[PDB]
């Protein structure tokens, strides 16, 4: 998974 705005 990939993304920004949150520390998963």
């Amino acid at each position: 998974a990939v993304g920004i705005g949150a520390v998963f």
Epitope: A1, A6, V7
Partner: antibody, heavy 116, light 113 residues
Framework: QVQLQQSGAELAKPGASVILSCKAS????????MNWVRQRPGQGLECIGY????????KYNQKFKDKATMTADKSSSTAYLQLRSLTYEDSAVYYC?????????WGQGTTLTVSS | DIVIIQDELSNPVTSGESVSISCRSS???????????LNWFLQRPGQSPQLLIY???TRASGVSDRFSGSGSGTDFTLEISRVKAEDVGVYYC?????????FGSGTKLEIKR
């Protein structure tokens, strides 16, 4: 546009389970994290957990730990939230949220009522 | 868990003026990558929350330029430079630096006419 389509409202009895659905269209379902949050009537927002749609890996808020189970079916591009052992306190609106930017796109509102 | 708290607006705001909505966290939201993990939402009655700002200062696609976000590692402010009637609703902050991501209780905005 990125779309999340939600299950219709359900009425369930104390002790039963229910499965809500979140269906992804117009974006690659495997790419982005999927978040599940709850909003009880008149109250604020509360994070239930989140799931990676590519491997089924999950992280839960411990308040909802044994009560909830998040699953993902890649063939149908649909995420599922199972709520077990329902109580009157679980009557709430349930949202799904995903996107490259976390909590960017929502859709949602499956009103769940537990009242016998 | 991280606890997040918001202030309230005293009375209906005047159209055209600036409005500040503030939020404080029980712990620093500055992560080791140098970004601050804080979201601002606007929720209207009967609708899902609409993301306004992420990473504490970056405006979401399509959000009016009247909205700006700023803050330190524990104190954050949402700015509405020229408030309009379309801005009424409930504003939420959220931290995303450590699970579980927690929200504040919301801050209601009403406008005078």
């Amino acid at each position: 546009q990125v779309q999340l389509q939600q299950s219709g409202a359900e009425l369930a009895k104390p002790g039963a389970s229910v499965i809500l659905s979140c269906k992804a269209s117009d974006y690659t379902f495997t790419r982005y994290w999927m978040n599940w949050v709850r909003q009880r009537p008149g109250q604020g927002l509360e994070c239930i957990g989140y799931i990676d749609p590519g491997n089924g890996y999950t992280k839960y808020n411990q308040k909802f730990k044994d009560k909830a189970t998040m699953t993902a079916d890649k063939s149908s591009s649909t995420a599922y939230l199972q709520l077990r052992s329902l109580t009157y306190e679980d009557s709430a609106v349930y949202y799904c949220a995903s996107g490259y930017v976390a909590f960017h796109y929502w859709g949602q509102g499956t009103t769940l009522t537990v009242s016998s | 868990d991280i606890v997040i708290i918001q202030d309230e607006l005293s009375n209906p705001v005047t159209s055209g003026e600036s409005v500040s909505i503030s939020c404080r966290s029980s712990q620093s939201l500055l992560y080791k990558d140098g970004k601050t993990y804080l979201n601002w939402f606007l929720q209207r009655p009967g609708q899902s929350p609409q993301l306004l700002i992420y990473l504490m200062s970056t405006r979401a696609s399509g959000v009016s330029d009247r909205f700006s976000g700023s803050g330190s590692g524990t104190d954050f402010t949402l700015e509405i430079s020229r408030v309009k009637a379309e801005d009424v609703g409930v504003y939420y902050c959220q931290q995303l630096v450590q699970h579980p991501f927690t929200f504040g209780s919301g801050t209601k905005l009403e406008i005078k006419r």
